[model samples]
Target: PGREILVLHVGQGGNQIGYNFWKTICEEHNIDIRSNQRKSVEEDKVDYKSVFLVEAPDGFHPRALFIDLEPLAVEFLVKEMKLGSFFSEDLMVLSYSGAHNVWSIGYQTGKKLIPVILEKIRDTMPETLQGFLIIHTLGGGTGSGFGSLLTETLKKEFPGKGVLNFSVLPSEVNDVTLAPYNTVLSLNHLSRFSDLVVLFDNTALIRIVKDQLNYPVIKQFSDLNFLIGRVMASITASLRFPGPLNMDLMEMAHNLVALPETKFIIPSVAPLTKEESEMSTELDLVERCFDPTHYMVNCSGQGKTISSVLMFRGNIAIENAFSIMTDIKSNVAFAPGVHPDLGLKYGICESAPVDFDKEVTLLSNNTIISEVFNRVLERFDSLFNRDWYTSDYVNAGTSKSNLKEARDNFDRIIKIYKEIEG
Candidate 1:
C-alpha cells in the first residue's frame, strides 16, 4: 500500500466504535497492541503501513486521532480498552467539559479548537495520504457537532481527497430529546461536505444482535461497537492486506458513487457469529447478503440501487459471487439505465482475517435510503413545527436560519435519492 488513511474518532460514539475497530484489526494483523509489534507468527505479506506508521523493529503507532470535547469517557475508555500505551499524548485531544448534548456547543467549541486539530492532522499526515475514515455519531454533542465541523474543514483543506464517513445515527428509540435537531443539523453538513457517507444506526445493529445472533443480553453499546468494528475492518481489509482485486478509498468513491448528490450508503457483513468462529460458508454469506435484516441501515427497500460492491475475503472464489449477483439482479430494484450486473462490482482479497474461514462484506448505494432521511425529517418537523426545544438550539449558537437550512438541505437530499426511482 503506497497511500495511507487517517482515522478520526471524535466523540463518545466515535471512541467506542473506533477503539473496537483498532482492536479488531490488531487481532487480525496478529500485532501486539502493547508494543505495536507483529505477534509470534511466520511473516506473511500483509501491509500494515497503510494503517500504521512503523518505525522499524517493534516501533509503530496507528495513524489515527481520538478527539472529543468531553474527557469523562475518553479518559476511562483508554484505560478500559488497555490502549493507554497504544495512543500517545498528541493523538488524544480533549476538552474538560461536555458539549451539553447540543450541536452548536460542539460545533462552536470545535471551531475554537480547529487550529490545534488541523495542526495534528498535518503533523500525522503521511507523505502519500489516501484520505480519511471518520467515525462519528449524528446526535451526540461532540461527535455529531465537532465531527460536522471537522469534515467541512478537512474538505476545505484537502479538496481533492475523499472523506469516507461512518456516521452512526441515533436509534429508533432515542434517549435524547434533542436528538432530531442535532442529527438534522449534522446531516446537512455531511451531505454537503463528505465524499461518501455510510449510515449505520443502533436500530439495525441491535436487531442483528438481539434477534438474529441471539447473544447473551449484553450492554447495548458494546454489542453495537463490535458489529461496527467488523464492518470497518472488512471494508478496509483490501487496503491493509494484499488482494487479488483491490479497491481503495478512491476506487470505492468512483465505483459506488454514481450520483454525488446522494451520498448515503448501506453496508452488511455475513456470518454474524457469536464468537469469531466459522459460522457460514462463502455461498451462505452471499445468500445472506440478500437479507435486509442483516443490513446496518434500515431502508424501506422502495428505492432503486445505483451501485453495489461485494468484497470477498479468504478462499472464496469470485465466480460464486458472480452467480449470486446474477441470481439477485432481478430481485433487487436498480436505478434506471444502470445495468444491474455492471453496476455490481467485486473485490477479492486472497487472505482472510485471522479467525474467519470465509467472509463477505457487501456495500450498496440505493435510493431506498431516502426513507431514512424522510424519517429523520419527520422527526425534525414534529419538533420544529411545535417550536419544541427550538430555543435551546438558538441559545447554543445555532441560528434559526441554520435550522431552516438543515431541514431544507435534507428535503433536497431525500428528493435526489427519490429521483433515481424513475
Candidate 2:
C-alpha cells in the first residue's frame, strides 16, 4: 500500500511534459481519460495504487498535483483534460502574475505557499508513500526555483522518502538570458535535497524525436513531449506490473546512485519506432543504450559509468541482456567492484505499454556527465562573471553570495564525476 509516488508538475514546461506523461501512462493502464476509470481487466493482476489513487470503484485518478505560479498551464490542463472532475480540488495550487522569470521570487513565493502545498500533499499521501516525482523546467522560475524549494521542503518533511525530479534544462538557442541563473540556483537546492534528478535538454529531445520518430517536421512541443512521456511510462512500468526482477523508487536509488551527490541520471529509450523494434538485426538494447546519441542529455558517454539500471518491457529476457553483455561491457567503464549483477541491474516489467512488442530504457549515472555539468557551469560563469543582471535575483530574495555558492556546488559535482572517471 505504501509503494506509491505523487507526480507534481511545477511550471508550464513541467505541466506540458506531465500532461503527455499522464496520457502515456493512462494509455498503458487502460484508464479512461474522460472518467479516470480503469477500463480494462488486463491490468487486474497489476497494482493500481502505485501511481493512481482509487477514490471509488469507477474513479482511479492519477496521484498527481499541479503547482504553478501562473494560471494558464493549470487552466489548460484542467479544461483540456477534464482534470477538475477527475482529480481533487486541493491538488491545484495556482497563483497569478507568474514568477516574472525570477528564480528567487519563485522560491520565496513558493516558500510562502509551502504550508498550503504541504497540506494538499499530505491529504494525498499513501500510508507509506514511496516518493514524489517532481516534473518541472529548470529554465524557468517556478520549476527551477520553486520546484527546488518544494523538493527541499519535502525532504525535510518526509525524511526517508525519495524526491526525484524530471528537470528540463534550458539552452541559449534562444533569448533566454536568465536561464543560467535559474538552472544553477535551482540546481543548488536540488543538489542538496532531491534523491534523483533525471536531466533532459530541449535540443537533445528535439534530436531524439526528429531522428527516431522519422518525422518530416515536428510542428509542436507536444510531439517532443510524447517521446519523453513514453520513456517516463517505461520507467514506472515495473512499479505497477508483475516482473521476475522489479524495482521501486527505493531500489533504483540504492543501486544506481552509488555515491552521495551523484543522483544525476541520464535516460534513453531503445526501439523508439516500430521499424527499429528490429533488435533482430542485433543492435541489442544493451548495446544501443550506450550510443552517444541515445542519451537524453548531451553527454559523450565516454567516461566511466558510476552505475546503470536497464529496465525492459515486453518479450525481453535476462538471457537476452546477458547475450549482449560482453560486447557492450567492453566499451563502457564501470566503477570498481561494481559487478554487472550489482552495479548494473536489470528490471523486466511484464506489462508492455499499448504499442509494439518490446522496449528498453536506460537510466545511466556515468562520469561522462561531468561534461554536462561543466557546460552548465560554463554558461553560468559566462553570465555571472561580470554580475550581469544579478540585481533581479537579489531584489526577489536570493542572496548575492549564494549565486557564487551555487557555482561552487556544481564545481564539486563536476570534480566528483572527474574523480570517478579517473
Cα lDDT, all candidates: 0.80, 0.79
Q: Local error of candidate 2 at 154, Å?
A: 0.3
Off by over 4 Å in 2: 41-49, 81-84, 87-89, 172-175, 278-283, 335-342
In model 1, the runs with Cα more than 4 Å from the true position are 41-45, 52-58, 274-283, 300-303
Tens digit of lDDT per residue, candidate 1, span 282-361? 66786576578888877544356788877898878667766777666777667896875577778888767666677888
- The residue pairs found clashing in candidate 1 are none
Best by lDDT: 1
How badly does each model clash, as a count of residue pairs?
A: 0, 0
Task: Go through the candidates in order and give the C-alpha RMSD of each one to the true structure.
Answer: 2.0, 2.1
TM-score of each: 0.94, 0.94
Per residue, candidate 2 scores C-alpha lDDT tens digits across 1-422 of 56778888898888878778877877777777677777767755555545645455667777888889989977876777666766456667888878877898898888878989888788768768888889998888899888989899899999888889989887536237888899888777888999999888888888887777867888756888876787777887887777778788778877888778888888888877865664432336656676767777866554577788888887776676667666566667776546654467778888766666778888888877788778878888988888897998989877778899888987898888778777
